[PDB]
Amino acid sequence: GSNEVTLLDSRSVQGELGWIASPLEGGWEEVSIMDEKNTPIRTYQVCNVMEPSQNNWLRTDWITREGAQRVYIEIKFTLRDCNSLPGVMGTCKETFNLYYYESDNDKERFIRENQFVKIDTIAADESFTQVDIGDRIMKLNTEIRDVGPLSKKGFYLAFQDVGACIALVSVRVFYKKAPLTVR
């Protein structure tokens, strides 16, 4: 810990996180690809633009909130630019939906509480970096988001894909101190 340390990374863990979500089949899939490192890492890719309406429900575990009203999280994903696709079809979504899940340690499971809530829309660009890789991910997309509704607790990421081609590159969480010491 020279300066700051990360909460948890999908690559840092490598092993399963406790996934328990996915469509019937063809949608989200677990495939290992080559990363900047020699050793391969477990990733996920979901590409299906043959019918807009699919509501791919994906859950992410291994997360925790901090004191700060909110926390810092960085998700890395790669999607196939339809603009680069010569005659893709014209039925591909160029947007994503991010949701969260919060709850108490042990009180009750109210429909209101359980009722998830979207965070914001994430899409390629914004912070796209060009890396010389031979795996596939030619256009990496990085999105910075935060979450910290329920002060009591509750930390869970949720992904939703609808007729869109996007893959997960990596994910990391980190805490930041917005309120600095001011006397």
Describe the protein:
The protein has 183 residues and is mostly beta strands. It has a single domain, classed as Galactose-binding domain-like (Jelly Rolls), CATH 2.60.120. Helices cover 4% and strands 30% of the residues. It has 2 helices and 11 strands; from the N terminus they run βαβββββαβββββ. It has helices at residues 10-13, 111-114; strands at residues 8-9, 29-33, 41-46, 56-60, 72-79, 97-100, 117-118, 128-129, 140-145, 157-161, 166-174. The strands form 2 sheets. Strands 1, 2, 3, 5, 8, 9 and 11 form a 7-stranded antiparallel sheet that branches. It has a 4-stranded antiparallel sheet with strand order 4-10-6-7, with no helix packed on it. The longest helix is centred in the N-terminal third of the chain and has 4 residues, at 10-13. It is globular. This is Ephrin type-A receptor 4. Belongs to the protein kinase superfamily. Tyr protein kinase family. Ephrin receptor subfamily.
Q: Could you give a short description of this structure?
A:
This protein has 183 residues and is mainly beta.
Structural class given helices, strands, pairing?
Answer: mainly beta
Helix-strand pattern: EHEEEEEHEEEEE
Q: Terminal Cα separation, in Å?
A: 28 Å
Number of helices: 2
PDB class: signaling protein
Keywords: Eph receptor, ephrin, signaling protein
Assembly: monomeric
Entry title: NMR solution structure of Eph receptor
